[PDB]
Amino acid sequence: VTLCSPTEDDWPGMFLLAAASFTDFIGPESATAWRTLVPTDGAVVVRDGSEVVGMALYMDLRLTVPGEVVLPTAGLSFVAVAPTHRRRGLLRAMCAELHRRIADSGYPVAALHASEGGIYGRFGYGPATTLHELTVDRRFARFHADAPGGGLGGSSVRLVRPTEHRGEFEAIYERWRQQVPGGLLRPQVLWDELLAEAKAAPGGDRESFALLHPDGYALYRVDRTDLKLARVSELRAVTADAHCALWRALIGLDSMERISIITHPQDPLPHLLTDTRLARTTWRQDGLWLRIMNVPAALEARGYAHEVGEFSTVLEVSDGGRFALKIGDGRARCTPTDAAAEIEMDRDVLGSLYLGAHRASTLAAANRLRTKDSQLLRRLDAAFASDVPVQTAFEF
Amino acid sequence: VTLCSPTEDDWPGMFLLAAASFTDFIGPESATAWRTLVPTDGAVVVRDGSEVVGMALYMDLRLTVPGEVVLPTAGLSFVAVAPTHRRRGLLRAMCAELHRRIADSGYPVAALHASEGGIYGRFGYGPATTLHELTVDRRFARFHADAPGGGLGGSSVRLVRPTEHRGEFEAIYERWRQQVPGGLLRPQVLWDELLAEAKAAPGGDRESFALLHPDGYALYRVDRTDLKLARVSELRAVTADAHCALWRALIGLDSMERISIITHPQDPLPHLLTDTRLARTTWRQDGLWLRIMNVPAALEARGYAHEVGEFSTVLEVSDGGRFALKIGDGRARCTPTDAAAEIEMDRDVLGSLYLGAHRASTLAAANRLRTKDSQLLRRLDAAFASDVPVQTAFEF
Amino acid sequence: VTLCSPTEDDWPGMFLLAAASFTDFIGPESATAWRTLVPTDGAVVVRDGSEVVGMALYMDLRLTVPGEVVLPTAGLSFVAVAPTHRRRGLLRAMCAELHRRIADSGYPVAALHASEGGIYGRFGYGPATTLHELTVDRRFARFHADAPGGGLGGSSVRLVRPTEHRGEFEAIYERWRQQVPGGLLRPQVLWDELLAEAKAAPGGDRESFALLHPDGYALYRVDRTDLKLARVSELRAVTADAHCALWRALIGLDSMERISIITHPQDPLPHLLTDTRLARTTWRQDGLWLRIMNVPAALEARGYAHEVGEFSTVLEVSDGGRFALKIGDGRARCTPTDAAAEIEMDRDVLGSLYLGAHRASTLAAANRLRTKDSQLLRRLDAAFASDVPVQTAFEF
Amino acid sequence: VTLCSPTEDDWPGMFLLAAASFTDFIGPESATAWRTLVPTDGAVVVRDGSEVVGMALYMDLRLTVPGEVVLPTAGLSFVAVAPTHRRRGLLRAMCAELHRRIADSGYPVAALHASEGGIYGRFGYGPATTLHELTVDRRFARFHADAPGGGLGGSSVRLVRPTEHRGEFEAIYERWRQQVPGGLLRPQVLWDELLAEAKAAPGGDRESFALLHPDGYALYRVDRTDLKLARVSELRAVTADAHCALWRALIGLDSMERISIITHPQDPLPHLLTDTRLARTTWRQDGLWLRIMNVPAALEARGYAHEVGEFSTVLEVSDGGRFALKIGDGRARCTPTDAAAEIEMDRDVLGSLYLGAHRASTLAAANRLRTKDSQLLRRLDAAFASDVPVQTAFEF
């Protein structure tokens, strides 16, 4: 049981463990695309004596954080221990090695999508974005007098085949990802992958259709089994006009009873309708998990609320350093100190505050975040909040 | 089809329309309790030529708003039109008369619980609180190292019969309702009603049990049909210690698979657990709806965030007045003006912002709230936000 | 947290913990009946400082074992720890005290019905009987030419009201319980209880009917919710003729689609039919759990198979003694020895072998029962097997 | 309506009737494999005037019976009557002809898997093995201290692609089938067939994985529709160590909630766990059905329990002969007699006793097996019991 970077000979063994560990695994051909995002020394494998019993890797990602700042991000993925080698400390060993390589490479943050919500807290990952499924019974849906696009001067939205308008989707996404916290750069190979899932599979998924606006798109397909449910896989809108126009078109799918979308808690769709209740929340889950690798670099890189006035405190991260934290005019300075800590938290708690999806007051109430000053809690709360609501880009 | 205050002779006709309109209607005996909250001239009925075809009333309530301020509130309830007299403008007529009487009586706000989410917007009611059902699979639930009450020095929580500890529940609730936005005074007759539902009904609800702490209680019963689900009807905790202690006791119901509770979006329960995902959101809905009767009185009565610096604007409510609004040091001054409006909104939108449950930015994105200054939107956003999360007291 | 025998003042606190711990708890009035089976010093309670947080008791029972031998049996029941006092070692403390009192009182065996199958193994209880639910689709059920009661000379079975034929049910049960391993004496107060559940409850269970033969009875009721399913609560047959006759009558319930019964794996009902498959096994579970208190007394008290020839071995029970075991002519002699052990097992494994429901070979295969002689395993297997199949009398 | 052996020209008509009669029919290409097991004169067809309206065949099989003895067995299969020609006595005619050919060919036993449990009794087939579905909720599954493979010195089990380890599966199966009653020789063409079902089908079954030990294997796949259920198609273990090791690996499938397997009633899996109840029996059914063609040859060929002492009786099979039966030292001598019968049974009842899956006492209780001596019943019972539990090899 030794720990090594894989060679080309190890990947067939890794694909086997992948097939056996992940039900949603397309196969080696689609793995070519994702492999291009794995740097040299981005992967570890554990061999027994020999076959692959353990694997983990990170991908080179670009993550938008509040203030429209883009951070280099290590995206953890393809993490698996063989069912034959459980409870043997292989995960702890692989996650220790990758975090070493991620930190030494100068990534300020690591990110992952959690297969289960009970594993990643103790490796320093906190849930940072929230997935919100809205189902609309579109048979009752009437738009509000106040909603943009009331006047029937002409619809600016077109129904199109995804593959014939790739260029336009790319351009809209690129604009979207740069202006939204949780935004991720989508490289060319993941657009190739996305538009190949857009075509109908024999006894699988149905054909995907696109609704295209100059400043937004929706990709949607009818559900395999429920033929009265349309699933919106992706809706990217850069302006409120684009968002309303795309929803007017989706509510116009008169052959459907229901439109479902995985969105964020602050999606304005419910407020576009005369009856806010018609857009039911049918499912909620943690989206993206963050591990702050370098506390000073991460806190200094993001923008803060201009509304809160200048303030200073001392932040202790458990086994992560103690820092003089000074926030004002939407910037932070974060410097070493041995002065008494005013705020204590585990590293995962910091990951949860970093994109503004969770309130310091909420984590404080659970005692995940300790302070003896409630004034400082309110100030932390307001400073870390995000003007632009945090969204989730795409699963990796 | 004339509109009148009911006499004692009208109430049997009102109870008939009640039984036929509301499935969850206990009966006339329990109606005695609620009737004591209806002032003289709090009720209107419509007779045909004669039987009751239309009714509506308000109750005298006390509603905690941000800044721990208690407002006199007209609680609309018992609103019904006979199925024989639909689409005849009876609701519009009854709601016009009650709003006249509510305004003339000097209530700054009216409130209701909506039977359907598509009716009350056009009478000026906006959804102001959010109900959040959490279901815990308590078989996997482990408390976090950071959670209060780790040390087994002795449990401060007792399992008790509700009826034998009324005095203690009352005292805890009274403390809770005074310090939480959305808090309502619960008078003696509604405690009588609550503790009578606490006993087992023959081929109905099972016996309710209480978990009692010095600074919190939970009332819970096993579900009629699902014998592995415990439903928490009510959990009132004044301190974070009480909240954790009560949840440690509920997770200790080893005969149950699942604990469900209707709570608020900011419930810290998920952060008390090693796996935040174990507390799934199974249901979300609008709780309390507010109609601001008097815009200047309501905006001046509540406290604002001390974090946002002093700022001035002109607010126009559609058919509700135009006001010079000046916010600073957590207070607002709101005075008549004919100066150009910087913010426009329908009255219902104001009701939705009033308790801090919805963000101005979110309503702005749906065009429910118009401005041409995004700086003013952020300032509005931060000022109207509530330090203490908004909760829902009890249905009426 | 002290451990004491309850006084009359403690029982209201015990009934509260009962209501909160057991969903199927009738109430204090029916508890009078069961209380008469609890000896003086049969109960322990744990008080905190004061309320009941822990309880356990045993009842005086009489258990038929192979060879038609009746043993005095301590029936453990009413075991509960308050959800407020979990993971505090209250169960381990109460079970240690009761086992002390049971052993000192001279009970050779203790018995219980397990609320969950993961608790009782480490207190020395092994599952000893198996519950088998058969559902018959009685619309296809035709009796075999070979089945007794083919000739229509006249039915010896009567449809009757349970309460009017108590005397006859008692006499048949008394005959049944004396000749079947797992048989329990049913005292008068449990017949009072049984026949009170036989009457219809308002918005609860439907009326119970009886099928009465000179040498058998069935009690059955239609299911609350499924009106085409008849549930046989109890079928006691002393002769094969009685068993067939009762099943001919149940298959004649022409208003039902399905007859379900909780029976034992060796129920001959499937072999009475032309299509054995029509009697589906819809559910299987551990019935009665045994803890052998005194290994020598228990092994000497039961009869063994006359078919296996005389043989000698040394049995070690983990922390339970080592014994020279000599079996021949259906009797065992069991005497102290320090000679080398040929068979090792935990005490619970012995409880599982004691009524002949599990095979030594099966437990050996799981390594619950160690030996280095496979000849001795076959001999153990054959000797402990029961001529009369083991059944389950009634839940306690 | 004449009865004939098919020619090559008849097989397309037989495949048509197959497709229309059997939902699980792969097609003619996979039928090539099974056809190689059909001897010359192993098949009958009924033509009308012309198309195939009736068919039946037997395959040359090798069946392990108690005492590790292998019998030549006629495996009945591909039995179908056209829906156009029901209730015309075609089955009775085809089954009479095949049984003639089977008996004349010198097969001591015939075997089949029953499509329905109500047909085959009257042609002399009795159910001889029992299929037992266990579902494990593997999230709660903890292995017992006593279970082999506790020490984490290194896992002896490998996760592998089935097709790359055919040789090893074959060798383990061959060892297994020779030492277990109900074991069947699996020829090369059925290994070809098995490993072709092991690969993923487009919009069909998912990829099959193998867990490989030196002395056991498991083949498993995730369910089509339920992505949290793993179905074990096949688990062959020659030693108890192999059986435990394979189950430790399956419980380590951390992406699954449930593991299901079709096994036998005596599977020790439940005893490997701290909570025996976690391995629920979710389904039970007759496996293999036996028709004893030659009573003297079949009774003389199998081994008997060495534990029962020598005894003699006279067995009458209804329309099957009367025999002096003498059993001692695990052998039987079975010779013609006209002496008074002590045991009577139909031929199917003998098929049910032959592999030791049913007890003579159980069949006696249903009056399927008549005697006036209960001593002789116990002796029959013990003699026919199988030391090694009876399992089911594979469906044909």
Ligand SMILES: Nc1nc(SCC(=O)NCCN2CCCCC2)nc2sc3c(c12)CCC3
């Ligand atoms: N990072 C990768 N993603 C995907 S698509 C599935 C997805 O979006 N989320 C679930 C991830 N989970 C399931 C399947 C893959 C493993 C983990 N496919 C692939 S192939 C491959 C990677 C990858 C990383 C490099 C090799």
Ligand SMILES: Nc1nc(SCC(=O)NCCN2CCCCC2)nc2sc3c(c12)CCC3
């Ligand atoms: N305000 C009142 N509440 C209740 S209890 C039911 C509840 O909490 N919410 C649903 C209200 N809805 C159903 C039943 C009553 C009518 C509307 N019972 C009664 S009786 C009665 C009132 C009332 C108002 C005065 C007469």
Ligand SMILES: Nc1nc(SCC(=O)NCCN2CCCCC2)nc2sc3c(c12)CCC3
């Ligand atoms: N031993 C007793 N049995 C019963 S009836 C229910 C039953 O048959 N099995 C489930 C037992 N379980 C549920 C309800 C009681 C507690 C445990 N009722 C009562 S009341 C009472 C006892 C008892 C023991 C003495 C006081």
Ligand SMILES: Nc1nc(SCC(=O)NCCN2CCCCC2)nc2sc3c(c12)CCC3
């Ligand atoms: N004996 C044969 N088995 C099979 S695979 C299906 C199975 O294992 N059991 C269900 C059998 N039942 C369904 C499908 C076939 C007919 C009966 N396929 C084939 S093709 C073929 C035979 C056969 C016998 C010779 C021609």
Ligand code: NA
């Ligand atoms: Na400071």
Ligand code: NA
């Ligand atoms: Na101004």
Ligand code: NA
């Ligand atoms: Na010996």
Ligand code: NA
């Ligand atoms: Na004889």
